[PDB]
């Protein structure tokens with residue numbers, strides 16, 4: 154299945170934060186309504202934050218996460234969880250190799266903000 | 268129900284990150300096996316990271332998040348989600364007032380690392 | 382926080398299924414847009430299904446689960462999870478006593494159907 | 496990523512329930528520690544329960560769900576969610592064709608029981 158794609162409410166501020174746990178340099182691409190709106194590049198084997206930004210979901214609400222290492226697309230896993238029918242987390246793990254820890258870049262999207 | 272309490276695998280490194288979305292100064296206490304091991308204090312209305320640390324879950328694996336504003340406990344909501352039977356997120360929202368956005372401090376615990 | 386309340390897309394068919402794990406006879410009230418549309422009454426200590434129905438979320442999309450035993454409201458826990466940005470689960474546990482297993486009545490809501 | 500694989504606590508009773516939403520006859524295979532322990536076969540386009548059983552996770556705690564239609568493996572999506580650090584749901588969707596509703600067979604695993 155396609156992973157790393159989420160439908161947000163329209164015109165909503167959201168946070169996106171990425172962590173790295175890999176020997177490979179991670180590139181995290183964030184698209185909103187099919188346009189790249191943030192890129193995070195970094196390397197850590199100890200969960201360093203490689204980016205955190207506030208974005209707007211726009212008219213269409215479509216948010217997509219892609220992750221690559223050395224130009225190769227990582228395999229993604231994702232889900233969305235909603236607490237108290239209001240607090241939302243869109244969650245992505247990614248695997249750049251074959252140990253299958255899925256933590257090589259970890260991305261957390263949260264809304265609402267403010 | 269009690270919220271904000273999670274059982275991690277023993278002696279495992281985990282990341283804890285806290286975000287703020289409130290006019291109030293947030294205090295986030297992180298307890299491992301019933302002892303405070305980290306406290307994050309900060310203020311933001313725009314999802315600033317008020318703390319991020321790597322910790323160890325110790326023998327018992329018990330991790331608890333408490334959130335307060337000027338000594339008054341916030342109301343917590345939480346869950347744990349596991350992707351690919353391997354990548355774990357323990358998620359906490361909190362409400363310090365009456366609007367019920369539950370984002371006033373948001374806490375993300377992730378494991379494994381490395 | 383309020384638990385057991387979920388916002389579904391309007392006029393959408395959904396499944397609701399309840400399981401019992403308690404000495405007490407469980408009464409599960411399903412409300413759609415603030416009106417009772419289904420009541421499941423049953424008893425099991427071994428996860429028997431005490432109801433399964435297809436319902437419609439109606440104009441407002443509001444679905445609320447309430448659980449009682451002997452006329453006393455059980456304490457609820459809940460969350461919603463979305464897989465592949467499409468497949469929805471709304472999950473409720475309930476506690477009728479002091480052991481905090483939250484499995485006394487378990488309710489799973491799923492959509493889409495068909 | 497591999498989907499539909501879950502680690503349960505050793506030697507634990509759990510419930511497994513399968514629902515169908517497809518024109519295709521669904522075959523759900525439940526394996527405990529790499530051995531088939533249950534097979535559910537049925538068809539429905541209205542969320543009928545095609546199987547519900549209580550099973551034990553055995554020494555190794557490994558539970559795997561596989562789904563096929565006419566001998567062709569369906570594509571799976573899955574996650575596990577834990578509420579109140581106690582109530583566990585292991586969730587599987589599956590897709591047998593091209594519409595990507597992932598509801599063709601839906602499997603819910605719940606524990607603890609009793």
Ligand SMILES: C[C@@H]1O[C@H](CNS(=O)(=O)c2cccs2)[C@@H](O)[C@H](O)[C@@H]1O
Pocket residue numbers: 174175176177178198222248249250251252253254257381
């Ligand atoms: C520390 C481990 O780093 C690998 C990725 N290492 S790598 O050199 O970037 C690659 C080797 C083959 C393809 S990429 C991670 O996948 C592991 O989980 C570890 O974090």
Ligand SMILES: C[C@@H]1O[C@H](CNS(=O)(=O)c2cccs2)[C@@H](O)[C@H](O)[C@@H]1O
Pocket residue numbers: 267288289290291292312336362363364365366367368371
């Ligand atoms: C901007 C809003 O801030 C409040 C908290 N306001 S406060 O003045 O810190 C408090 C007043 C009484 C108790 S705390 C948040 O709850 C809202 O969600 C907004 O972020």
Ligand SMILES: C[C@@H]1O[C@H](CNS(=O)(=O)c2cccs2)[C@@H](O)[C@H](O)[C@@H]1O
Pocket residue numbers: 402403404405406426450476477478479480482485609
């Ligand atoms: C088997 C256990 O049943 C109780 C509820 N027992 S009861 O007789 O309904 C009550 C007694 C006082 C208040 S309700 C569950 O809460 C336990 O989890 C067990 O399943």
Ligand SMILES: C[C@@H]1O[C@H](CNS(=O)(=O)c2cccs2)[C@@H](O)[C@H](O)[C@@H]1O
Pocket residue numbers: 495516517518519520540564590591592593594595596599
């Ligand atoms: C009603 C729809 O049924 C299909 C499956 N159709 S089928 O005839 O079983 C197949 C044909 C080729 C491969 S399987 C589901 O995928 C849809 O989601 C609908 O539920």
Ligand SMILES: [Ca+2]
Pocket residue numbers: 247248249250251252253254255256257
């Ligand atoms: Ca890896």
Ligand SMILES: [Ca+2]
Pocket residue numbers: 174175254255256257380381
């Ligand atoms: Ca890694």
Ligand SMILES: [Ca+2]
Pocket residue numbers: 362363364365366367368369370371
């Ligand atoms: Ca608030």
Ligand SMILES: [Ca+2]
Pocket residue numbers: 266267288289368369370371
């Ligand atoms: Ca707020």
Ligand SMILES: [Ca+2]
Pocket residue numbers: 403475476477478479480481482483484485
């Ligand atoms: Ca109980």
Ligand SMILES: [Ca+2]
Pocket residue numbers: 402403482483484485608609
């Ligand atoms: Ca019980």
Ligand SMILES: [Ca+2]
Pocket residue numbers: 517589590591592593594595596597598599
């Ligand atoms: Ca389908």
Ligand SMILES: [Ca+2]
Pocket residue numbers: 494495516517596597598599
């Ligand atoms: Ca279908």
